[PDB]
């Protein structure tokens, strides 16, 4: 439940969660079980957020919150992303299946978070494509997932087929992420590597072309200090009034 200001007890719990104090977290949640799902918009800091937004998730700590009935239906970072959406954004199959086993809700737009890093050539790898296939597999199938919308009318399949790569000069290279997904969806580990190297070669060619022609006409003012490459932002679905007006 929403708690704008974290109480002293909730900070104490979240402190123990971040510090990896397994016994303290367990003992806190034993006496005060209502603390497990208290989040603070717009940051959405919460016991769950302290374990989910780490490079390497401490699933031993995550199991503790699961034992005290943590839920996965509320945003867990200031991007207002649900736990499943964060798993799709990172294409983290380990976290994604862990959540689906623990009955985490999969929003309709959750597949569209698989594509936020589809603008980065460095993410067009075998494991990332395989992980996405293992993720789309658990969400049904390529055809079942390709139909889901993103709160802007755009469908996953149309988005994956109309993907693009951005270089550090702002130039784009259009490619087909669905075809990359379709080329391996459970020999094929060579069809993809040829498709990837075709795109890897086309990206490197366009990046050299834009270095000579685009120069920093885009990058200097519109990309400095931003994400490089700029992520494919999923359209905003969860809206919240400002505190100055509430």
């Amino acid at each position: 439940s929403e708690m704008k200001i974290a109480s002293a007890e909730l900070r104490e719990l979240m402190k123990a969660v971040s510090e990896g104090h397994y016994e303290t977290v367990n003992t806190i949640l034993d006496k005060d079980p209502e603390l497990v799902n208290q989040y603070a918009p717009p940051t959405y800091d919460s016991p769950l957020a302290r374990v989910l937004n780490k490079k390497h998730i401490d699933y031993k700590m995550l199991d503790i919150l699961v034992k005290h009935h943590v839920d996965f239906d509320y945003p867990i970072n200031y991007h207002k992303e649900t736990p499943i959406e964060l798993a799709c954004k990172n294409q983290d199959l380990q976290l994604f299946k862990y959540l689906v086993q623990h009955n985490a809700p999969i929003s309709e737009q959750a597949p569209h978070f698989l594509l936020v890093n589809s603008t980065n050539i460095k993410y067009l790898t075998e494991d990332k494509i395989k992980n996405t296939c293992e993720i789309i597999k658990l969400m049904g199938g390529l055809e079942a997932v390709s139909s889901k919308c993103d709160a802007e009318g755009n469908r996953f399949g149309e988005q994956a087929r109309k993907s693009q790569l951005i270089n550090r000069f702002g130039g784009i290279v259009k490619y087909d992420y669905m075809q990359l997904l379709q080329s391996v969806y459970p020999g094929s580990t060579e069809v993809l590597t040829n498709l990837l190297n075709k795109i890897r070669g086309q990206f490197s060619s366009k990046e050299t072309y834009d270095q000579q022609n685009l120069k920093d006409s885009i990058s200097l003012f519109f990309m400095t200090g931003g994400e490089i490459p700029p992520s494919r932002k999923v359209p905003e679905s969860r809206f919240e009034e400002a505190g100055i007006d509430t």
Binding site: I5, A6, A8, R11, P42, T43, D45, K55, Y78, H79, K122, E152, N154, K162, Q164, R168, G170, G171, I172, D210, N213, L214, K215, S217, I218, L220, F221, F222, T224, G225, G226, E227, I228, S231, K233, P235, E236, F239, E240, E241, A242, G243, I244, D245
Partner: protein, 436 residues
Amino acid sequence: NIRFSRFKQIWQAIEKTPKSKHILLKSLFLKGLLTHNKPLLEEIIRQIELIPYSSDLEMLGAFSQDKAHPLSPELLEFVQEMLANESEKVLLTILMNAFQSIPELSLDSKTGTLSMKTKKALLPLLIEKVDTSIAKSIMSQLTDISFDSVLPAFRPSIGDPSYQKTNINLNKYLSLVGNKTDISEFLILTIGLFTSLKIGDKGFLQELSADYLFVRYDDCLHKIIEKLKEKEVIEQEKEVQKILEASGNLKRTSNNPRRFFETRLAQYINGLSHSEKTIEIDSIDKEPEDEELRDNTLKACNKILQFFLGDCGRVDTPREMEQKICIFANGSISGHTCNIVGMLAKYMTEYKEDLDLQNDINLFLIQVIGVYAKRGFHAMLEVIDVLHDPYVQDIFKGYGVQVNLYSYFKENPELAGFLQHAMNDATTYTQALVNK
């Protein structure tokens, strides 16, 4: 005209892109029109899923060369119509981005530039067919129309390729410290020398760096003579005597090492928000030393900025921190800070129950200092002055928030990397400055 129909198709194909790209693409298109950037125009046309024909390049003025009247009368009318059909906030953002992304001066000729004389003329012309209420409302807000050469932000803890540890020796020190320098250049090199040679505790170097930051040069130099009086440091006795004599042969303005330090410090402070998504680290399991500071800052800054800006106040990158803080301050440099302090009172009223209030306010103010000193000189101490003003100090005190930024920079170890990396680059800078 059919060329106007083609122009509408181009403009409206921008609007068929995801909504998060309309502002970017329209600003880039307006820049490409005003600067005759043919590659940029072709890139935009291909990016909105269109095909660029040579007729499009001719009509869009790509092959033009008139940097004083870039938009032809026909193209100017086209742009006037398209901007008239635009919302006020959107039109303000588009014009601001288009003008602030265009340089006035450029050594490399054939890079599209527009003088300030021309920008001042283009702005009212572009909104000529715009609603006159929206027009003058834009003429009032669009006061900074000049080029914004956005300085990069740095985060060495994640392997930032920009960082270069200074190479100051005991030998290079003594040769340069032969006091042709001034007090600032002397203190920078000394702290840079004590840092590489480990002539002090980590908190000691941070205490020296905080005395230099707050222009306590007399306090800083005194603690340096006290450190040299130690017996385990005189060898690493004859060269230490040379360090003392320099303290009485100094010059005394041309404070470029001071300006470089303050600017570089702001870039490291503003760079806290950098991650591997904002800096390509093509090499490589350990957490960065500033990770908790970065987590606490992005939490504090999101709570504060989204309190005023709503969902549009979300901050994830150094640039967004820079952008949303400047926007929030518009709801001189000391004037912008005083407005921030006034608005923080509303935040500290709603969040007076928050146990993180003092830490959130202080973390946010550090970022504000980083935002303003990164966009202009002299701004750092200007922000520091009003924040330490007794009337502002009393506003914070009435909410239970202490703002003593000297003790914060001197004592708190999470701010040590900011001073160390700034004093590192200031040593390299001052090394080559006096080496000429």
